[PDB]
């Protein structure tokens, strides 16, 4: 599938099962007047340690379209640093 790309926050992030929404207020760097659910697995985290979000933190990704819609391929902080979490 086609990568796509956008930015956005962690909308919320269920450590537990390991995944969370990210709302996507931005694609290819236009803001959208209306922000969209992205799923994200954990494994698709940039960052070193014990991978999950942290609710509202600021994110840049590279997704895909699939069956269920929208769905992460790699996750970032802003600027391409590892994604904060919650440690």
């Given at each position: 599938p086609q990568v796509l790309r956008g930015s956005g926050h962690c909308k919320w992030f269920n450590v537990r099962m390991g995944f969370g929404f990210i709302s996507m207020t931005s694609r290819e760097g236009s803001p959208l007047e209306n922000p969209v659910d992205v799923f994200v697995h954990q494994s698709k985290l940039y960052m070193e340690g014990f991978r999950s979000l942290k609710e509202g933190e600021p994110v840049e990704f590279t997704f895909k379209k699939s069956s269920k819609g929208f769905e992460s391929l790699r996750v970032t902080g802003?600027?391409?640093?590892?994604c904060l979490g919650n440690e």
């Open positions: 802003p600027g391409g640093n590892p």
